[PDB]
Subunit: 159 residues, 2 copies
DNA sequence: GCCACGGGCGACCAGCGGACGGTGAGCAC
DNA sequence: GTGCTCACCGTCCGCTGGTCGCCCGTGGC
């Protein structure tokens, strides 16, 4: 498998141009990973093995073997909060992307910018970020990062 | 010395004391209740610290229980008798009548264990072979990992 | 061609879930 | 004690989930 093109900040309907991938692509990867999970579940059930509820190393292995190693653990864990903000607050995810673009910032920056509206979101639902993940059917299958929980708790602690 | 080694289990009628240097089955089942309480504690603690919050009885929860002076709630034992506990949660009457029978015949815990599998497999088959589903349906079972062996045996009954 | 800009993902690790049988307690006579 | 019953639970192991920072692609010159 060839090393994949770097991501760049994008708008909801906007294409990436050069040797670069867009954010809508990024989000699609999570959809694909969900489908691969579903496959792995069906296979496991037919073999009579344990059936995973989350996107595990097993599911990554499956995706890779199906020729999609670009869906790998490091990357997926890296941009989860972004994906979460997209699933939970479409409008906000979008308008933020717009802004980050207008200012001309990198993915690394956009990442950080995604944390804060998510923390706001958690605070509005009794600080229960883990609850938010378990509520949305497309987030249910992703482990909630330590860092997000921490940052929610620190906003609880300071404000 | 966080605990002296515990008395062996013996087959028991629902509510029989289990006289001797021996523990009964209702005690066995109580251990799972205690483990659930310790899980609940660990959850509350984690939430107040802002750490990750477990949904199942993990090594962390066992460590907690041990530190609270209940190392008799340990992973090997708990994983050993889960299907028994599951049958108890899902089919009280059956769990009971089975215990009665195993007693009347005069069997050891090791035997009663095996006898517990089969009504459970029947149970799974009646809910589209989804034993993992059964665990996730009952609010007292959702906190326990489903053993490989139970899944296998459900699948073999599907196959044979 | 040089060389910095920045991120995709290899690789390592701490600890988990699983699993077994070694030790050691239990018993009726 | 006797010989012997038999299960509690330490202990080890193969991964997993998390982590992070290199090596490599990429770009303006």
């Amino acid at each position: 498998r060839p090393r994949e093109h770097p991501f760049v900040v994008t708008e909801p309907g906007e294409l990436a141009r050069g040797k670069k991938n867009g954010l809508d692509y990024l989000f699609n990867l999570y959809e694909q990973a969900g489908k691969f999970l579903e496959e792995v579940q069906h296979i496991a059930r037919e073999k009579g093995e344990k059936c995973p509820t989350k996107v595990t190393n097993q599911v990554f292995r499956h995706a890779k073997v199906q020729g999609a190693g670009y869906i790998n653990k490091p990357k997926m864990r890296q941009y989860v909060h972004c994906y979460a903000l997209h699933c939970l607050a479409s409008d906000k995810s979008d308008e933020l992307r717009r802004c980050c673009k207008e200012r001309g910032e990198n993915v690394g920056a956009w990442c950080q910018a995604c944390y804060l509206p998510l923390i706001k979101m958690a605070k509005e639902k009794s600080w229960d970020i883990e609850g938010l993940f378990n509520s949305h059917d497309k987030l249910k299958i992703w482990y909630v990062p330590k860092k997000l929980i921490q940052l929610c708790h620190q906003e609880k602690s300071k404000h």
